[PDB]
Design a protein around this ligand. Structure first.
Ligand SMILES: [Ca+2]
Ligand SMILES: [Ca+2]
Ligand SMILES: [Ca+2]
Ligand SMILES: [Ca+2]
Ligand SMILES: [Ca+2]
Ligand SMILES: [Ca+2]
Ligand SMILES: [Ca+2]
Ligand SMILES: [Ca+2]
Ligand SMILES: [Ca+2]
Ligand SMILES: [Ca+2]
Ligand SMILES: [Ca+2]
Ligand SMILES: [Ca+2]
Ligand SMILES: [Ca+2]
Ligand SMILES: [Ca+2]
Ligand SMILES: [Ca+2]
Ligand SMILES: [Ca+2]
Ligand SMILES: [Ca+2]
Ligand SMILES: [Ca+2]
Lengths: 191, 238, 191, 191, 238, 238
C-alpha cells in the first residue's frame, strides 16, 4: 500500500564495499516494510568482486554499508554505499515520499559527534556465514540509526556493520560471500 | 498346485557390513540387508518383514530398520564415534503378516563401523612446562610437549601439529611431532651463552595435521602456549 | 488501524524497577503491532535514577518489568511496573478495547502455580548493553506470557526479564542504562 | 485479509518427527503472516510421544521438520512431516490459493543437488529449550527455503532443523519437549 | 485518658535469623522482623517504621526492608555466595511519622546466611600430570589429581568426582576421591611388565558429586583430561 | 611560453611516518603523503597520482592510498598488532594521466607503527603449581607463577597483576609481580607449625595492570587459580 520499500528481491550489483572503488562490488538486498508504528527490516549482502569474496580468508573481518537519505526518504548515492535508490513495490507519480519508512528522529535523534555517546541509536544482533566446508560462523551485526550526520545534505542515516572475529579463518580460497538474512525492527517517522 | 508357507525367509549373507560417518544427518542411508522367500510371490507367504532383534550397545537407538525394504537409516539422534566406534547388530526376517511370535526364525548379523572425523581439539597434558638446556650445547632435547586428542588414534585427526607463534625469530629452536607418543619434540639448533643472558622463552600453537571438522571451527580459538626455558651455567674458565 | 498499541516513541519516566520505589525510575518503550494472527513487539528500557544507572557496576544483574492487564487489555497500574496505560497511535471514544493486542490464553494459558512447569509460556532471546568504554555485553531476555496470575483482577500478563552474567562488570561508574531494542512475536487474542 | 496462514494456535498432534512412524508424534505450531513483500513466520514444536519426549536425554540432538507445498501453496502430506494442510485464519471457497505465502523462487531458487552450494537459501538463528531443572539450552535453528526439490510434484520447500550440542544432556527423564518460539522473515512469492 | 507517645517500639528479639538461597530471583522474601508499640493503636504513636541502620559488608545493597511490614526481600542485584556467604545487619524501629532524627531509638540485629548452590566447575591445579609405577607392582599410588572448587568446602557441590573416559578398558586402574584433600586417588590394581611395553595412558572426566546448578549447565563441556603414565624398569634376571 | 612536462613530481620527504591503533574501524585516516610538480598548475603536467609500489609484509592489504589526495586509510580488513606490529611501505608519484609505465619515477617510503591495545588475556604456563615452605620459616619464596601475555612486552597491557580470591584471610601470604620475568612472586609473611596442620592452600586471580580492551571484556571470566602448598617437617625436639 505504499507499504514496502526495497532493492528488489534479487538485485544486481548495487553496492560498494571496497574503499576507493567506483563501481558496485556487492549486491545488497534490503526490504523495509511498514507495520503500525514500526518498520520491519530484512537485509542480506552478497559479494560480487574478488576483493569481497576473499575477505573471509582472514579471521577478523569488518564489512560496512552506509545509507544516507534525503528529507523525503530517498537515497543520496554519492555518499551512500548503495548506488541505486530504493523503490516501492508499486510504481511512481513524482517517484514518491518515503519519509514514513525512515528511522524516527525522536526515537533515534541526531547528536554531538562525541565518542561513545547515545548507544540508544544502535540495534545489535547476529546473522551467519556458512563456509564452503560447511562450518557456520556467527556474524555480529550493528545497525546505527541517525545519530551522526555525514554532511549538510542528509536527513536520515541507516548503517550496517557485519563483524567476524573467528579463531580460524572461514575460508582458504575465494568463495561467494553471503550474509544470512538479518531481521530487525525500528520506530518509524511519520508519513 | 496350491501354495503353502513351507519355507522360511533366508538372508543372502550370514553377516552384513556397512559404514557411516560420524555426525551424519538424520535418515542417512547406511546400508541394506536382504532376504528371500521361495513361496508364491506377492502373497503373505513371501512378504518379508525385517526387524531388529538385539543391538550393541543397545542404548540409545540410532538406527531404524525399514521392515519392508531392509534399508537401514540413521535416526534424529546423532552418531558420535568417540561415544561408540562400532555397532554390532542382530537382525531378523519373518514370514506372513510380520507378526512377532515365539517361533524361531532365521537371523543374521550386521556390523556398522562409525567413521571418525576431526571434531576434537588437541590438549597439552604436560603438567610441568619448562625447557632445560646447558650452555654451549647443540642438538639437545629442550622439552617434550605431551598432547592428548580424543579422535582416532594414529589418524591425521589425532596427530599433533605445531607452529611457533612468537619467540623463535632467532632460529634457536626446531619442533617436530613424534607420531608414536604424540609429543612435540623441541630441540636446540644453536649454542647459547649463559652470561649473555638472552631470553629464549617462546610460544607455540597446537592443532591437528588434518583440518578441524566444520562442526567445531570458530569454536576453536588458537591460543599460543607459553614455554619458559632455563639455562645451566658451566665453569668455562678465563 | 487500531493496529498499534504503545508507550509512545520516547516516553518520559513511566516505569518502576527498584523495590519499594513509589515513583518511576525508568523509561520503558514498548510497541505492540498487530500482524495477522500475531503481535510483533519491540521493547527497550532506559534508566532514569541513580539506582538503575549503577546496576551495571555489578557483573550479575537482573532487571524485571511486569505488566498486568485487565479484560479489555488496559494496564492495571497498581501492580504493574508500568504506571501509565498504553495508548493507540490514534485517539479514544471510551478510551478503547485493546484485547486483540493481548497474548492468547489458548496458546499461553494460565496454569497451576507449580514450579518449573509450562515452559511453552516463555519467549527467550538476547539483546545488548553497550558500555561506556564501548564493550558490548549480551543481555539474556525472558518474556513470560500469561502463565501465572498475580491476583484476581488480572486477565493478561506480559513480563520481561533482562539478565547480565558477565565475568567483569560493564561499568565502574554511573552510566545511562539502555537495553538495545528487543523484538519478539506472539500469538494474539481475538479482538 | 487472507493474510494469515497457519496450523491454528494450539494444534493437536499434526506432525511426524520419528522415522518410519505412521502417525503424528508432535505438535507443530506454524504461523505465516504477509507483511508487504515479506512473510513474518513463527514456529514452535511440542513433543507428543515418548520417543520425542526422551530425545533430550542425549547431549547431541537433531530434529528435522520438512514441509513440501504444491503450486498453490498447499501442503503435500505424503512427503511432508506435517500431515494436515495449513489454513487461512478465515474460511474457504475452493479452499484457496496460498501461493503468496510461499518463499520466493527468485530470492531462494531451486538449484543443482550439489553439496554445500547456495547457502543464500538458508536462514540461521537460535531458540531455546528450558529443561525440567530449569537450565536454559540454546537450540541452533536452520530454515531451508526451496533449494532442493524432493520429487516432481513439489513447487515450494520450507524445512526446519533444531540442533542441540550440549556438554551434558538437558534431561535424565522423559519431559515434554518444547522449542521456544522462533521468529523469522523471508521474501515472498507473488499472490 | 488521652494518649501520649511515652514508650518506644521494641523488637520481639534482640537477634533475628533467616536464610536465602544464592542466585535468588528479585523480591524474594527472605524473612521478617517485628516490633511492638504499646501506645494507642492506629495512631502515629504506634505506627512503626522499620529502617536499615548499617549493613555488612554494606556494599552493594541486596536487601530491601519494607518499613511498614518489616519484611525483608531480595533486590534486582543477584546474590552470590562465593562473593559473600553471610550478611549481618543492624535494623531500627521508629515512632510517629518515621522521621530519622538524632534520637537514640531501639535497634536489633539480623543475620542472613546465603545458601550455596553448585555453580562452580572443578579445576585441576595439579601442575605436573604424569603417573609413576614400577614393574611388577600392585596396589601403588600412580598419581594424585589435585582439584579446586569454589563452592562450599565439604559439600557435594565441592566434592570432586571422577569417571574414566578412555584408556582403562583393561582394568589396570582404580580411582576414588579423597574427601579431605579433594584429590583423585588413582592406583594400580594389576601388575605391568616393562618389556611388553603396554601403553597405560588414560583420560578422565571431572565433575561434582552433586549435579551442577541449572545456571551453569550447557556452559560446561566435559573435556577428558589426559594423564601419561611412565613405568620403571627393574633388573629381573633370566 | 608554452608548458612542457619537463620535471617529475618529488616527495616533500624521503620517508614518512605515521601510527594507527590496532582494531581500528574501516577507513580510518592513518596519515598522508605529499609531493609537488613544478609544471603548469591544473594541467596533466602537474596532476599527481599516488600509488603503492610494494608493501611489507605485503599480504593481506590493510591500507588504501587515495591516488589523488595521497591520504592513507585503513581497509575493511582489521589491523592486529599481534599479527603485524610495523608496516614499511614504498610509495610512488606519477605525472600526466597517472598511467603505470616502465618509466623510473620518484619513490619514497612510509613507516606505519601499529599501536598495541590490551586484547589478550594472561595465561599461566607454570606447568607444576605447588608451593613449598619449611616449618618455622619467614620471608621465603613459596612459588613463582609464570604468566604469558601476547600483548606488547613491557607495557601495562602485558604486565601481570594478581589478587587473592580466597585462602589468604589469615594474612600468611604476600604477592607481587616481577616486572622483568612477569612472575607472580608469593612469599611467606608468617611462620607456620607443621604439627598444627593448617591448610594454607589458596586461590588467586590473574589480570593485566591496565584494563582489558572493550573488544575482549565479558569474553573474560575471572576464574580463580588454585595453588596447593606443602609444608616440610623439621626435628624440633621437646
Ligand atoms: Ca514363505
Ligand atoms: Ca565427535
Ligand atoms: Ca570422531
Ligand atoms: Ca584432533
Ligand atoms: Ca658463558
Ligand atoms: Ca659459565
Ligand atoms: Ca508509641
Ligand atoms: Ca555463584
Ligand atoms: Ca554457591
Ligand atoms: Ca562444584
Ligand atoms: Ca619385564
Ligand atoms: Ca626389567
Ligand atoms: Ca610535471
Ligand atoms: Ca589483537
Ligand atoms: Ca595489541
Ligand atoms: Ca594483557
Ligand atoms: Ca611443629
Ligand atoms: Ca617438627
Amino acid at each position: 500500500k505504499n507499504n514496502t520499500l526495497w532493492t528488489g528481491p534479487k538485485p544486481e550489483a548495487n553496492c560498494i564495499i571496497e574503499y576507493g572503488k567506483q563501481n558496485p562490488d556487492s549486491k545488497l538486498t534490503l526490504i523495509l516494510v511498514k507495520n503500525g508504528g514500526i518498520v520491519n527490516g530484512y537485509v542480506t549482502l552478497m559479494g560480487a568482486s574478488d576483493y569481497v569474496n576473499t575477505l573471509f580468508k582472514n579471521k577478523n573481518v569488518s564489512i560496512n554499508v552506509e545509507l544516507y537519505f534525503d528529507a523525503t526518504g530517498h537515497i543520496l548515492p554519492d555518499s551512500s554505499s548503495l548506488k541505486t535508490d530504493l523503490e516501492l513495490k508499486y510504481k511512481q507519480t513524482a517517484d514518491f515520499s518515503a519519509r514514513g519508512f525512515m528511522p524516527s528522529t525522536t526515537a533515534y535523534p541526531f547528536v554531538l559527534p562525541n565518542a561513545g555517546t547515545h548507544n540508544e541509536n544502535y540495534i545489535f544482533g547476529q546473522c551467519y556465514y556458512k563456509a564452503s566446508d560447511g562450518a557456520l560462523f556467527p556474524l555480529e551485526v550493528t545497525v546505527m540509526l541517525n545519530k551522526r550526520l555525514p554532511d549538510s545534505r542528509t536527513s536520515y542515516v541507516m548503517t550496517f556493520l557485519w563483524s567476524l572475529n573467528a579463531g580460524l579463518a572461514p575460508e582458504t580460497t575465494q568463495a561467494t560471500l553471503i550474509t544470512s538474512p538479518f531481521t530487525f525492527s525500528y520506530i518509524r517517522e511519520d508519513d | 498346485v496350491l501354495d503353502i508357507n513351507d519355507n522360511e525367509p533366508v538372508f543372502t549373507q550370514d553377516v552384513f557390513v556397512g559404514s557411516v560417518e560420524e555426525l551424519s544427518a538424520a535418515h542417512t542411508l547406511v546400508m541394506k540387508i536382504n532376504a528371500t522367500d521361495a513361496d508364491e510371490p506377492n502373497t503373505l507367504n513371501s512378504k518379508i518383514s525385517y526387524r531388529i532383534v538385539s543391538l550393541e550397545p543397545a542404548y540409545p537407538p540410532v538406527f531404524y530398520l525399514n521392515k519392508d525394504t531392509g534399508e537401514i537409516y540413521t535416526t534424529s539422534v546423532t552418531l558420535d564415534r568417540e561415544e561408540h566406534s562400532s555397532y554390532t547388530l542382530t537382525v531378523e526376517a519373518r514370514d506372513g503378516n510380520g507378526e512377532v511370535t515365539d517361533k524361531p526364525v532365521k537371523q543374521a548379523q550386521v556390523q556398522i563401523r562409525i567413521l571418525d572425523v576431526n571434531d576434537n581439539i588437541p590438549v597439552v597434558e604436560n603438567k610441568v612446562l619448562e625447557g632445560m638446556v646447558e650452555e654451549n650445547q647443540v642438538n639437545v632435547e629442550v622439552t617434550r610437549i605431551k598432547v592428548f586428542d580424543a579422535d582416532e588414534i594414529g589418524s591425521d585427526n589425532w596427530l599433533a601439529n605445531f607452529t611457533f607463534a612468537s619467540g623463535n625469530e632467532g632460529g634457536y629452536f626446531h619442533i617436530e611431532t613424534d607420531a608414536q607418543t604424540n609429543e612435540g619434540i623441541v630441540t636446540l639448533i644453536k649454542e647459547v651463552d649463559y652470561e649473555e643472558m638472552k631470553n629464549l622463552d617462546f610460544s607455540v600453537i597446537v592443532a591437528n595435521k588434518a583440518a578441524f571438522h566444520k562442526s567445531i571451527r570458530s569454536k576453536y580459538k588458537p591460543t599460543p602456549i607459553p614455554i619458559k626455558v632455563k639455562v645451566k651455567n658451566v665453569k668455562e674458565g678465563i
